[PDB]
Design a protein around this ligand. Sequence first.
Ligand SMILES: NC(=O)c1ccc[n+]([C@@H]2O[C@H](COP(=O)(O)O)[C@@H](O)[C@H]2O)c1
Lengths: 464, 437
Amino acid sequence: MHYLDNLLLNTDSYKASHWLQYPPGTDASFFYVESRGGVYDQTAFFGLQSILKEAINRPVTHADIDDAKALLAAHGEPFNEAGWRDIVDRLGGQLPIRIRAVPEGCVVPTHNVLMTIESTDAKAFWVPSYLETLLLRVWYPVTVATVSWQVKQIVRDFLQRTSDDPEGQLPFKLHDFGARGVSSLGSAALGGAAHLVNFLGTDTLSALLLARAHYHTPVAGYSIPAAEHSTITSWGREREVDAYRNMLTQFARPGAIVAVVSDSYDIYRAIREHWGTTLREEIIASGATVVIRPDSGDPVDVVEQCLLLLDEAFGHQVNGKGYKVLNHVRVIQGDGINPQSLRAILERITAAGYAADNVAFGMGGALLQKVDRDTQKFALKCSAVRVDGAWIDVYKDPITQSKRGRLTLLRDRATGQYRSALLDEVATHAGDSDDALVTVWENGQMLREWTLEQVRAHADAARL
Amino acid sequence: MHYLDNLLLNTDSYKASHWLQYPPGTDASFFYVESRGGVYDQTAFFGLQSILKEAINRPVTHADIDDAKALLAAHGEPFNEAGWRDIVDRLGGQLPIRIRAVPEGCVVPTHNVLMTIESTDAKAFWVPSYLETLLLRVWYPVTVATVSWQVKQIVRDFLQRTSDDPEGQLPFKLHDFGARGVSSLGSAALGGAAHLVNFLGTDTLSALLLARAHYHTPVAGYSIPAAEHSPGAIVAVVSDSYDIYRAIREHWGTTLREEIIASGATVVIRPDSGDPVDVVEQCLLLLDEAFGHQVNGKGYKVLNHVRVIQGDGINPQSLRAILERITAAGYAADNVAFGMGGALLQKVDRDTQKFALKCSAVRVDGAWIDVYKQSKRGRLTLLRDRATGQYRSALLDEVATHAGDSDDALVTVWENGQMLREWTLEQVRAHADAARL
Ligand SMILES: NC(=O)c1ccc[n+]([C@@H]2O[C@H](COP(=O)(O)O)[C@@H](O)[C@H]2O)c1
């Protein structure tokens, strides 16, 4: 929104004053971004394109400078007015930086250069450090994309073992429910979009809006009509079955998919007590796939139970792998899902003989909110400065061998393995490796740009 | 940004399909928000005003409907085109709802009505539930404001025991360093603002912009420059426990100290390594050796010329552990401040305070009926007991019957396109500050 538009105020306060802290005769700076470890050994890189389009969407102006000079003096921070005025007057307000990055969607082992930021102007060498705050927030779409990607590898494994069509099934197995459980609208759009790197099912409309505006994708994902807790109960307990039948009247057509929520005990009652008998026929006659979502009881146990109970209500087919596929009905567990309980469910149900085709998984806050900058120990570090015309390495520990100097990422041509290297070694090892980064942004201009489909192809091709 | 400027698409996909799921003859609905428990026993209510100003900043338009209709059909959801067109053509595109809420800054025990949402138009009764997704996100400013307020009560306790000016010291004792570690710019602005409900110090400039645009506050908070070491009243310098020790014993430290006192500025040391508790106590012990102290009127030591801010590993537990160690060591709580970043602005979720928005009543065939899973149900509100200030939840019909003992504690903040009751941040700060454990 409009009150946040000024780029000069999109930073931590203390970093506005960093230009005064450089040695005299400093001429240039070079930064890199990496995951220093954390929950997973590899990260799907995603979201930088959206961050750049949204946070650097116009030249800096004199009005930006006036506003930032006034606020920062009152707030108590020094502000390099003359430095910003020169950038506006001489460089047309375009940030004199070059950003290189691994193509979005690639999956890269931890401890590797994911992007570099370099100054492209001697006077305005300090601009990269000014952008650390907004750039380091790339940790969020990277981490969400990674969590979603890791779940995809678990689901893909079980579909490969138990499904006749594992890649036809896989895009719909993890559904984003996190729009209400995430901390703002912008994070819903960006984290939801990061999920869509790996799957097609989402209820986070904001992610469609971002994918459409920033990743050239008119309709990045899909969903289905689904019942709410509130709507069912408000019919009253004496007409509760009529609420479910109305779901069928409104949405159940051949080839259509409709979800209904119910607590686990009512599901058991409906299959035992024969008032659900007319619900079964209307379900069967509809030709629709009715997805049942249990919303009480143990997240793992209840899936297996629903499968067994629905099997006796609706029957099953045995597929080519020897696993049962229920007729007409499916189960989605939307509660308590994380990579461990998800794996537990899949282990439980396939051991019971049910194909992974039968179940889907909803994740909300656990996908979009329960991540932080430490999940993958994200860092954005200075690695080199040019002083008195000479580049000097910048680092803290000499060990982690530690990354220093002007850096890039290499991909080995035969194996596809990644490794970080000095820009000095992109020759030399030509023949065995190619430079895996690309220039995505330079001096106010976005250069290399991806569609979400291009992002999806990198992520889908990556395996554990 | 502009690509998110369509309220019809600020919701969960399935809510597009929802108006068809009510029983026939439904013509009103009623919802309330509460914390169902979690980490703390009470929540500081904050952020709804920002959410409404941003998420409902204009009347819905026909362009909004065209856009939503096309996207939702392709996405796979039905779309109540006629219902939205009616809201545009008949109601000027203003949402027919009434939102009531406890004044922002109030601190309310869990399991209580914090806000209510009611429909005000028979034909458009389904709008409150459409808005659940964006309204329930109020959990985030509430929870940041609560974590920040819970910390404040801890520091306050130790300042009342050890400081000669507890309430003058308190507003600077928790600083926000959270902008790198939060998921987005908008979260940074809103969560940063939620912290400023309780304190004055922040490095999250985005929070100043939100407070200025949404809470009528030009300069909501302050900071000091920080020499990272590889007017000017106060300065932060980064260090470690051993570094201070080496300065004391190496001769470059006696001229280092000469410069510090000759400058007459207060130096704030931030250690960035070591056990949070041990490193604060040791820095204090070494800084006392180097610069001396005064004994304040409670008998605790206040260092000359130096302060310590611990910005690493801070949470309500380590924070208290620190305060306990230094005060047992005889040091006043004046000497130290605390920084939180992602631990404040990011490491919270909707389950921290178990936030929920629930339908409690619908009108069907003329008659109101309760909706529920003893349970809270019906058309609800919050009461404040007039003598004790204690809150409880009640049915609207009970307000008059207890008018002698209590007042209705909600206010109407928003109705039919118009914000009514509206707060400055200083009013919010006053409610939070008056509340105690
Ligand atoms: N289409 C749907 O049924 C839908 C959409 C969004 C959220 N939800 C529900 O909202 C809850 C989300 O919980 P969390 O966001 O805290 O994970 C879950 O119960 C989820 O099932 C359901």
